[PDB]
Design goal:
The complex is a heterodimer. Chain A is mostly beta strands. Chain A has a single domain, classed as Alpha-Beta Plaits (2-Layer Sandwich), CATH 3.30.70.80. Chain A has 1 helix and 5 strands; from the N terminus they run E-E-E-H-E-E. In chain A, strands 2-3-1-4 form a 4-stranded antiparallel sheet, with no helix packed on it. By secondary structure, chain B is of the alpha/beta class. Chain B has one domain: Peptidase S8/S53 domain (Rossmann fold, 3-Layer(aba) Sandwich). In chain B, strand 10 and strand 11 form a beta hairpin. The longest helix of chain B is centred in the last third of the chain and has 23 residues. Chain B starts with 7 loop residues before the first helix and ends with a helix. The chains are: A mainly beta, B alpha/beta. Bound molecules: calcium ion (7 copies) and zinc ion. Chain B: Keywords: Calcium, Hydrolase, Protease, Secreted, Serine protease, Signal, Zymogen. Chain B: One of its GO terms (molecular function) is identical protein binding. Chain B: Belongs to the peptidase S8 family.
């Protein structure tokens, strides 16, 4: 399972969608049209094909400076 | 507890002469520090910690257990901004400013971009969970709301992600000054988020006014970032280096600017842009009052130069 951030079109996306591909909602952003989701590592391509999904971005790492 | 000293970096950025005007204790003003969390009971910090929140693993928790510093880095960065002016320890640039400690990095000082974005939103929303409660489009500086006026990010990554940037844009449009470390790889340009136009990228100087060799180049301004004594857990003090130590000096300077300006005018200044060289914008003020080291003008080492709070505040008020 991997964590991914999906930029969505709210007119065509529903958070209940992600269960359909074996994933689940971690966090829905209030301030930007995006949702954090855990998906099976092998379902990323499938997620990019899901309704209302505009961009799928891996969760990158920052470090203390 | 040791008797109080003023660390060399605080002196270098010309903070102590500001304190008769303000120490940043203007009630509408808070600085959100997105880091490893905070030693929230530290005797030299506690009184200034207004809110403690964590966004680790994509869940927002306001519990002290979850927001406490498990690394030391957050505590150190927070003391450079806001260690109290009293009889012990150290003193921050803005020793009366309220701090929101937003834990986006884990015990090992590593963080996911998702958690950082959610951290940025916490700084906009504030303890009340609402960005703009009276719906007037004023967020930072609105005494009816509880948004931070500065977001300080002593952290960085190599990725430019659409959604993190969207969140930076939201903070910027809320009137929040965003300040971030340039990075510690001696690279030719800053890390993200410092590298975004909306964000002040900060480089590190040492006590000889030389740019630190590790400091990522092309910053916007530079500040003390080598041999920086500040608070450290548990209820102690430690000396560290890096662009993460320089960043809070600049965040403290912005806090002083916006505090002084609100104290006089009952408003705050616009954030401004990288190119600004006017007095009408926080960033323009920072740029024109900065100590211009190295070659004349902006340069790839120091940016515009070393920030100077005394002069910045005078430019704000005059
Ligand atoms: Ca403590
Ligand atoms: Ca002190
Ligand atoms: Ca709020
Ligand atoms: Ca408002
Ligand atoms: Ca208002
Ligand atoms: Ca505020
Ligand atoms: Ca120069
Ligand atoms: Zn999960």
């Amino acid at each position: 399972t991997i964590r991914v951030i999906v930029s969505v079109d709210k007119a065509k996306f529903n958070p209940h969608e992600v269960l359909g591909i074996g994933g689940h909602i971690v966090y829905q952003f209030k301030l930007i049209p995006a949702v954090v989701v855990d998906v099976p590592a092998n379902a990323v391509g499938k997620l990019k094909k899901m309704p209302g999904v505009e961009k799928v971005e891996f969760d990158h790492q920052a470090v203390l400076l | 507890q040791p008797a109080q000293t003023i660390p060399w970096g605080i002196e270098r950025v010309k903070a102590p002469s500001v304190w008769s005007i303000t120490d940043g204790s203007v009630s509408v003003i808070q600085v959100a520090v997105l880091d490893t969390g905070v030693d929230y009971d530290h005797p030299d910090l506690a009184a200034n910690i207004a809110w403690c929140v964590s966004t680790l693993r994509g869940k927002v928790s306001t519990k002290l257990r979850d927001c406490a510093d498990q690394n030391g880095h957050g505590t150190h960065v927070i003391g450079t901004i806001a260690a109290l002016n009293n009889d012990i320890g150290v003193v921050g640039v803005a020793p009366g400013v309220q701090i929101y400690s937003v834990r986006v990095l884990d015990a090992r000082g590593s963080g996911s971009y998702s958690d950082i974005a959610i951290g940025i939103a916490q700084a906009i929303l504030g303890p009340d969970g609402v960005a703009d409660k009276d719906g007037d489009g004023i967020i930072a500086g609105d005494p009816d709301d509880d948004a931070a006026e500065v977001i300080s990010m002593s952290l960085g990554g190599p990725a430019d992600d659409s959604y993190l940037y969207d969140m930076i844009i939201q903070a910027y449009n809320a009137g929040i000054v965003i300040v971030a470390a340039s990075g510690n790889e001696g690279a030719p340009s800053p890390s993200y988020p410092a590298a975004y136009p909306e964000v002040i990228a900060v480089g590190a100087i040492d006590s000889n006014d030389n740019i630190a060799s590790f400091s990522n180049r092309q910053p916007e301004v530079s500040a003390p970032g080598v041999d920086i004594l500040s608070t450290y857990p548990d209820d102690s003090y430690e000396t560290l280096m890096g662009t993460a130590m320089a960043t809070p000096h600049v965040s403290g300077v912005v806090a002083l600017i916006q505090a002084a300006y609100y104290q006089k005018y009952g408003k705050i200044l616009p954030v401004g842009t990288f190119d600004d060289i006017s007095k009408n914008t926080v960033r323009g003020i920072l740029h024109i009052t900065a100590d211009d080291l190295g070659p004349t003008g902006w340069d790839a080492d120091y940016g515009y130069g070393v920030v100077r709070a005394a002069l910045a505040v005078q430019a704000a008020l005059g």
